[PDB]
Amino acid sequence: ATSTKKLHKEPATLIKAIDGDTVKLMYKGQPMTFRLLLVDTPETKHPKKGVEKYGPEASAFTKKMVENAKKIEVEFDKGQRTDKYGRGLAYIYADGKMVNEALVRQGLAKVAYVYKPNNTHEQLLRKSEAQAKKEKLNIWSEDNADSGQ
């Protein structure tokens, strides 16, 4: 990138994944946490016994994912580069693929947290989420709050 055009794609080094949308990597050579943009996990606070539903599933999904990826990159949007929590906001790409899209592919993370101007990849994640709905991938299975304990 000799000049600036759209976003700023850069390299990254996986360090320790914690949740499905939370993975600490290495940026600029220093340790930092990154949060998938335009996406949100199905409540993965993992307090103790978990909800026994989508607890241990999304977090590991991205864990082994970037863990086996040959390379890890990030794409900061045109909006801010860090949130109020000091988290880095960008799109992680594993093997030249959009990891965020992989999650929506397995119906593990639904689109959420959309605030301009950080939403350039909101279109691709949009049509993708719709495909996950027709694919019924976990979260997109049942549809009601009754008889689930």
Ligand SMILES: Cc1cn([C@H]2C[C@H](OP(=O)(O)O)[C@@H](COP(=O)(O)O)O2)c(=O)[nH]c1=O
């Ligand atoms: C991802 C994202 C999060 N947020 C805020 C809303 C949420 O506030 P609260 O912390 O009060 O819930 C929090 C969610 O981030 P996470 O998706 O990392 O949990 O960050 C934005 O304002 N814009 C964004 O693009």
